[model samples]
Target: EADIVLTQTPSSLPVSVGEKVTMTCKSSQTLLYSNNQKNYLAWYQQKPGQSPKLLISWAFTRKSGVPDRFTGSGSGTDFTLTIGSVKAEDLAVYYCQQYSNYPWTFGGGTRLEIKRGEVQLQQSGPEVVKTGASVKISCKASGYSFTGYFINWVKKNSGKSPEWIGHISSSYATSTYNQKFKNKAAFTVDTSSSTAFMQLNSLTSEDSADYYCVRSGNYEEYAMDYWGQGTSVTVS
Candidate 1:
């Protein structure tokens, strides 16, 4: 199987509010799509105790309603995410991901903390489920209207790229799954408590990984905006 590796620099940076900041993500290969003349890259901002938010897609297209202060640029193997004027709310870890090919990959992430400001997902703890059994993971949301967005799930093994498992509508409870996980996982939600759950079935050793509950922007499936801390699942 072919996979691409992405490198992000300055694992952490202390930035002052109102100042400008820029980060880079270098890919192992070009990310430009020949036919459309588009770069298949995306940027995300993950705040502590929160999910990763989709900031820009196609390398430069900001998501609807995203502040114009944030910009994405560059092409080929090098890409950049710039904060025109960083604000207290902009303190978070920024990540770049390439969706140009299978096994979509993400950078190591750059943490942008306020130079003189203070900062903080709840997911079920680790679970050891026997092979062929099922395990349900729970994620609770607070500080926002949970039902307004879709809840997505992601799976990441140690030292591996994160995989999109699927997503469930917080309001309707309807779900869609990645074909690779279609038969292995099911989703459910509790709007009353603003909670979402994923039930992974018929587990095997290969299913072991950290599972995260992500929040998608309104009507935007791939624009994930929030994430849980992630629950580790070990199949034995």
Candidate 2:
């Protein structure tokens, strides 16, 4: 009754109000006969330069014209979007929502920066680096049960933020990675201290992004409800 599958991923698009928004949707929890095959639901919208927008209401039905970008799928709670590519002009925060129950929730709104610039890399040390080397950064979870949920790692290259990474269950023993960084990045957990780590592969400038590690629990919200303060690393 709880899971998500990201189907459509828009590049870090930047936009404003009166703009169209689209978010990818996926079913990861599974749809079995036992639960009456829960599927089809609703999607929420968040306004850029502002708070999240409730663009679409009740799933497939649009609260407004919105645009072709806001698409959906599945019947009970399984649907998706076909926004293969996103533009800054159509930029705004987007999310997929379900009308199930307490466990019902929305995807983390993708933050769209109107003018994408240097990736916000908060480093704790010097900017020196060495080739053929690696770096480890930590993301600390402040609120909620860190032991009850799993954490996710996303690599937003250049100034283009992307959720191309992995999700490690709170059990801290499971992991799923984006094909883009599976071979280049490594993830590990330490529930003992409630901290997660991302090991970058052979330092390279292309491996830069304000590396973020997040976590969402078994509640209605599968999106990252918790985030690390953020850390920046560079390859020389």
Candidate 3:
């Protein structure tokens, strides 16, 4: 049981259409099919030109005539997605999936905003936050650790509700925070360009937040199991 690590932290927020998005799936292993086999789960919702709407599958099975605004429960390793009321065509963007096997991954998304364009939090900042300030913000490693599995951070706000900021085991260079962002933010790991960093802390005003950093992978207990290509952090 060590093949799961999907994520969503910030990933973009700012919702106000109908609201009811709890898109989350955090697992590192445990779709619990080790003996009986078959823990393939799914959840997707993407729009703009349209081409992603499978809203829940397998674990709860709801794939034909998908509606009810889309809903899903939990299984072997906790899973969810509740979009009860969100119109304006549903504002576009929402993903979480796992086929239980395959090099299949996608969960580096959370932009379900209703009306407000112009955002590409593929972020990297001049970070210098003071006041007990902790700092580590970066996201630049296209295609496998700059080359397969490291560089990760997720925290966005235009609204998709994400928070799993803590990863870096370049096999193991150490750095993991999410005791709900250990002291607020400060994570680092960089094997030359297999980048990964997140830092925020002390300063109050809720640490003035909004964060993202991506290009990811983690296969541990089987919950959150795959994602990348996302970075957005807005704070002042």
Identify the candidate with maximal TM-score. 1
**lDDT by residue for model 3 (1-236), tens:** 44356775446666666676666665566664776654566666656543344555555556566778777777776777777776777776776766565333456666778753311113464443556545556655544434345544545444344445666555576766555566666666666865555656565545454554533343432233233334333334
lDDT of 2: 0.53
lDDT of 2 by residue, 32-123 (tens): 23454534354544344322334444344554456666565555435554343445554555556443432333455455555332111122
Candidate with top lDDT is: 1
Off by over 4 Å in 1: 117-133, 137-152, 156-210, 213-236
Report the lDDT of model 2 for residue 88: 55
Writing each residue's lDDT as its tens digit, candidate 1 over 68-137 gives 9999999999999999998888888888887676555678888798965400047899999899999999
- Our model 1 lands, by Cα RMSD against the true structure, at 5.9
Candidate 3: TM-score? 0.30
Q: How high is the lDDT of residue 136 in model 1? A: 93
Which residue pairs overlap in candidate 1's backbone?
48-120, 49-120, 49-121, 51-226, 51-227, 52-227, 53-225
User: Higher-TM-score candidate among 2 and 3?
Assistant: 2
- TM-score per candidate: 0.65, 0.53, 0.30
